């Protein structure tokens, strides 16, 4: 019964035009195997697009837009059809004019369109949707705010390329309020949108900080739902890729104790992101490395370095290694790391199959040795305590083998460690290793 419907939708009688649009909208709503393909191939999209113009009944506009939305929320190719019919600008102008039911349809449509790819995202923005979308967050209608937030986050999503910052940054003031919503889905989507916005240059991080977002985000790290934790954690982590002052705002908002909580999350990936986040704080200045230690984060970090999944261990190793940087100007830090038992896990990690981490791990071990060496030379002792700890943990053997690694920098640092801190007993090797090695 479809070629009939296609003709009833062409009738100049406004009465039949509606009846037809309504029948389309209904089959297009079937839960199981919607007939989106068949309806598209009957050529009726452009006809439905016309039914959304200003010069049309409020009741017809609704049904046409609802039908099209059902199409645009299908496959990437069925969304493409709706976009190629120039439906976006009419969806957009319906956000101003239309009633609330109509607004909710168009906002959902534009969300599905904006979420298909970075091109469609830019396209929605170029068609000046930002202005009307923001205007929706007055409605005090929970389901509409929920939807508008979902769409909003899709306009911010994507790093390569980033969206036009001068446009998407206009949403910061609204989001700043949205992360106070009591509707979980809203809250979640608002946090995603912030995680995307904060994921960029120092100018973007600063925008996030200047609307006072970071205070609230830190509070949200202890929300009961991991659906909130995740994006919130991520936004906070992105802020701390920034400079020392930026990082300091998040520490000042209470992020270290919240990170403590997350280092014992049931989800492995929350723990991984938490480690990453802490590692970017121990990459910070000496006060901040001390703040990390004062928040009792080292002990769980060390525990994860020994028993966590590999991806989590690498991130934890960064956190502990970055922290030993500050050990050359504050030797208390290294002493505390050592005493917390981080030597054996760092050593055991040298055999991981990742040269990026082996390097970081050797840098951490060198810093521990340099502090152990300056410790014994400062008080006329004849032994490097830290060197003996590394030796007794089978770390000497492991560092020794790193000289048989293909990366020249790894070999060179390992060679240096064996010569400097293990002098009489373990030879360093020079370059007859012309049959190279690694992978």
């Amino acid at each position: 019964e479809l070629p009939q419907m296609t003709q009833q939708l062409n009738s100049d009688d406004m009465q039949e035009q509606l009846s037809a649009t309504v029948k389309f909208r209904q089959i297009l709503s079937r839960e199981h195997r919607p007939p989106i393909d068949v309806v598209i191939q009957a050529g009726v999209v452009p006809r439905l697009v016309e039914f959304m113009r200003e010069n049309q009944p409020e009741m017809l506009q609704l049904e046409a837009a609802w039908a099209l939305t059902n199409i645009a929320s299908g496959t990437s190719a069925q969304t493409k059809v709706v976009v190629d019919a120039d439906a976006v600008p009419l969806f957009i102008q319906l956000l101003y004019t239309g009633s609330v039911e109509v607004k909710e349809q168009a906002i959902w449509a534009l969300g599905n369109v904006a979420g298909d790819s970075t091109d469609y995202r830019d396209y929605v923005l170029q068609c000046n949707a930002m202005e009307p979308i923001l205007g929706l967050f007055n409605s005090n209608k929970p389901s509409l705010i929920r939807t508008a937030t979902w769409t909003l986050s899709n306009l911010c999503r994507g790093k390569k390329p980033q969206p036009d910052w001068s446009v998407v940054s206009q949403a910061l003031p609204t989001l700043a309020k949205l992360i106070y919503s009591m509707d979980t889905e809203t809250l979640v989507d608002a946090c995603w949108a912030i995680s995307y916005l904060s994921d960029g240059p120092q100018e973007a991080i600063q925008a996030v900080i200047d609307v006072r977002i970071p205070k609230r985000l830190v509070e949200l790290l202890s929300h009961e739902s991991t659906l909130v934790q995740t994006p919130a954690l991520r936004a906070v982590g992105n802020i701390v890729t920034g400079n020392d002052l930026q990082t300091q705002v998040v520490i000042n908002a209470g992020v270290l104790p919240a990170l403590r909580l997350l280092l014992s999350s049931p989800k492995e990936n929350i723990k991984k992101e938490a480690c990453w986040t802490i590692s970017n704080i121990t990459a910070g200045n000496t006060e901040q490395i001390q703040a990390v230690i004062d928040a009792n984060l080292i002990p769980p970090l060390v525990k994860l370095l020994e028993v966590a999944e590999d991806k989590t261990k690498k991130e934890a190793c960064w956190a502990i290694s970055n922290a030993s940087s500050g050990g050359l100007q504050r030797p208390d830090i290294i002493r505390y790391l050592v005493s917390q038992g981080c030597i054996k896990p760092l050593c055991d990690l040298l055999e991981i199959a990742d040269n990026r981490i082996i390097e970081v791990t050797l840098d951490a071990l060198e810093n521990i040795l340099k502090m152990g060496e300056a410790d014994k030379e400062a008080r006329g002792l004849n032994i490097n305590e830290n060197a003996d700890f590394i030796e007794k943990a089978g770390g000497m053997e492991k560092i020794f083998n790193c000289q048989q690694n293909e990366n020249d920098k790894i070999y060179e640092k390992a060679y240096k460690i064996i010569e400097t801190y293990f002098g009489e007993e373990e030879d360093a090797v020079d370059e007859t290793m012309a049959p190279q090695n690694a992978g």
Binding site: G115, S153, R157, G158, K159, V188, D189, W192, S195, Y196, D199, T230, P231, R234, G237, N238, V240, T241, G242, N243, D244, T247, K267, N269, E273, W276, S279, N280, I281, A283, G284, W318, N322
Partner: peptide, 16 residues
Amino acid sequence: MNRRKIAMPKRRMAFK
């Protein structure tokens, strides 16, 4: 301070 994440991802639709 030091390191971007491996991928922005942590996107709502793709993550875990």
